Design a protein around this ligand. Structure first.
Ligand SMILES: C[C@@H](O)[C@H](N)C(=O)O
Ligand SMILES: [Zn+2]
Ligand SMILES: [Zn+2]
Lengths: 401, 401
């Protein structure tokens, strides 16, 4: 259950000194990352989020208008062009405000939900770098909600539901919650936080979610809720965050005309469910011990022949599953069937279809799982239907288990 | 047909002084970008390419070894960390070779086609920047094919086929081809350049493709076949590029075991079809004058009620088309129906479905196209099926045209 070892055995990715903390995603590891994105996007559509994409660098001047330069200066990568300094973005927040600032906004537009899978970089100390868990280049399932204070509570409940919704898909049911409160050095009236923290606590209650407080550990711009997952070895992983922000929209001159024909500054919610996706893949790799559920498996099916006499039939079936949207590969090597099955099992390929003369004659396939299960012979289309259903529902378990 | 104006008009994207030559994709523009991406991926699958993701930056020492520092220094953004210098990548090739170098390779593994939607940055002179066509930050529909010298003919032919294939999807049939030869500043011997230039010249001749030389315009590492397409305004746009490289693999220590079990350096073919996603979207915007084919349209269908009477029916139908994979929006504003239809026509929404009391009891919808054509009352499932077919075939024309 070490993701670094598994990542090498399954040829998912690799790292090297020429790019500390920046993942070289191989075909198979990138397939998992892309399927995660597909999954998140399905939630974006469901919970009604826009998806945008911001540039990787912006003038040091704009970053200074946020405050990110005092708190993050030491973690930002800077570069330049024609005598102007630019910072490689360490977060997507400012960029999303720039998008909001384009076009007159009114209460009729709020709540405005803006998501993005945009890579960020932080010049983390090389010594603290570790596999997919602590990196310099990372992509969070980031989003920002611009709303009025009268919408906050409903928005937080929206994020709450999404959290448990996504976590349950990967089998994570044990979730600990912590609501960090007002720190000594903050930006806002004690009155403000009273309402802010109230919103967070009431929202957690409307969902019956026990929680503890991390007194004085909120950000200077607002209180927050963090969700910590527990994997099968009972290890905790903080991944979810719902951060209220009462100072960023103001510093970047964001505003809208309220129903009271006046000009107000929207409230900004920062939320991420999985957190760093590179890290999340590392957590799942260890949680599944490399046995990724079929919807995430780099290669879902390998079809193999006994002798080069079923080769033609194997290719035929490989095209069918492929056209069916299944990640399938044909193993026509000159190796014994047991050698092939052993290899694909070690690679954790969910299903293996064996094709001997018997299967060719009947137009069926002998089905086996990576768990050593004999699933009998099946018609090609029965297999395809069963697999599409397992993939579509993102089922954690295979056929028969 | 000014992509800059259309882009602001349809809320596709925007640029600002704090990040010159770098695009902010708004929801609708990003939707187009993502659909293009889905299209390219359908081709990567059909043409048998792997898809990977490399690091955003790599050690300057790596770039010195490739020759990029000596021949490409001016175009590169640099940054540092822990007394080390890093170049934000201007190209994806070196990263692809690093991935290639992980794990022993044999002739059995070739040709190995490795694609990436590579985020690249080139510090282009500010004065030469222009909308989406000339930018500093872009996304290349890049790939590198690692092959033997004997496979060069077939692999180059594959890239050539891929160029005409993809361009035809967008209605670009008039294509002019050119061969850019050895530049003043280059790496590799005159013998290697003679051979690489001849291989490409012969590939064009064998394909009976007339061409003209672009003397001294090759890449510092190899000659290239460049493809220029023409839009409906008979304007020329250079986009596609196929490059033959006998230098970078050797310099980056790439090798594979030949059939004669001898160690060999693989040949590397570089190719991008669209060039950059950004520029291609700029071209498409002018080509279609904002009237994006349905598969690309940000919002494919807008459903409108007349009065509150039909609000319930509209919500139901929208929910229904959305489940059918169609990008749909309901417009229940208390506005005259014509005002609504006008606004959406202005937005180039392919189809507008109007619902009056009649449609509601009828269980149908009144269909109008953004070109102002009246398609009459249609069964809801009939439109859904027809829209799905138009989207799936990536057709350039709407119902009735
Ligand atoms: C096409 C791509 O692979 C090449 N390196 C280029 O940027 O020109
Ligand atoms: Zn944020
Ligand atoms: Zn290249």
């Amino acid at each position: 259950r070490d993701h670094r070892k598994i990542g090498k055995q399954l040829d998912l990715y690799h790292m090297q000194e020429e790019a500390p903390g920046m993942v070289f995603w191989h075909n198979d590891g990138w397939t998992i990352f892309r399927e995660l994105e597909v999954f998140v996007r399905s939630k974006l559509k469901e919970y009604q989020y826009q998806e945008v994409k911001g540039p990787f660098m912006m003038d040091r001047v704009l970053w200074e208008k946020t405050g990110h330069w005092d708190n993050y200066k030491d973690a930002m990568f800077t570069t330049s062009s024609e005598n102007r300094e630019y910072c490689i973005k360490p977060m997507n927040c400012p960029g999303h405000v720039q998008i909001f600032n384009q076009g007159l906004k009114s209460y009729r537009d709020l709540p405005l939900r803006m998501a993005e899978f945009g890579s960020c970089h932080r010049n983390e100390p090389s010594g603290s770098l570790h596999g997919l868990m602590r990196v310099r280049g990372f992509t969070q399932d980031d989003a920002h909600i611009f709303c009025t204070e009268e919408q906050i509570r409903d928005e937080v409940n929206g994020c709450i539901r999404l959290v448990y919704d996504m976590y349950s898909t990967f089998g994570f049911e044990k979730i600990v919650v912590k609501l960090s409160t007002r720190p000594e050095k903050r930006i806002g009236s004690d009155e403000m936080w009273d309402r802010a923290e109230a919103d967070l606590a009431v929202a957690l209650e409307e969902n019956n979610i026990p929680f503890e407080y991390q007194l004085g550990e909120g950000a200077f711009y607002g209180p927050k809720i963090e969700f910590t997952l527990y994997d099968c070895l009972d290890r905790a992983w903080q991944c979810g965050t719902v951060q209220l922000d009462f100072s960023l929209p103001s510093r970047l001159s964001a505003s809208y005309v309220g129903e009271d024909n006046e000009r107000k500054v929207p409230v900004m919610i920062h939320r991420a469910i999985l957190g760093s996706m590179e890290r999340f893949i590392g957590i799942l790799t260890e949680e599944f011990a490399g046995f990724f559920p079929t919807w995430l498996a780099p290669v879902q099916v390998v079809i193999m022949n006994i002798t080069d006499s079923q080769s033609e039939y194997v290719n035929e079936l490989t095209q069918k599953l492929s056209n069916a949207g299944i990640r399938v590969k044909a193993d026509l090597r000159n190796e014994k069937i047991g050698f092939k099955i052993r290899e694909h099992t070690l690679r954790r390929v969910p299903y293996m279809l064996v094709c001997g003369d018997k299967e060719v004659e009947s137009g069926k396939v002998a089905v086996r799982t990576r768990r050593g299960k004999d699933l009998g012979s099946m018609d090609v289309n029965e297999v395809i239907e069963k697999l599409q259903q397992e993939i579509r529902s993102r089922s954690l378990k295979q056929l028969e288990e």
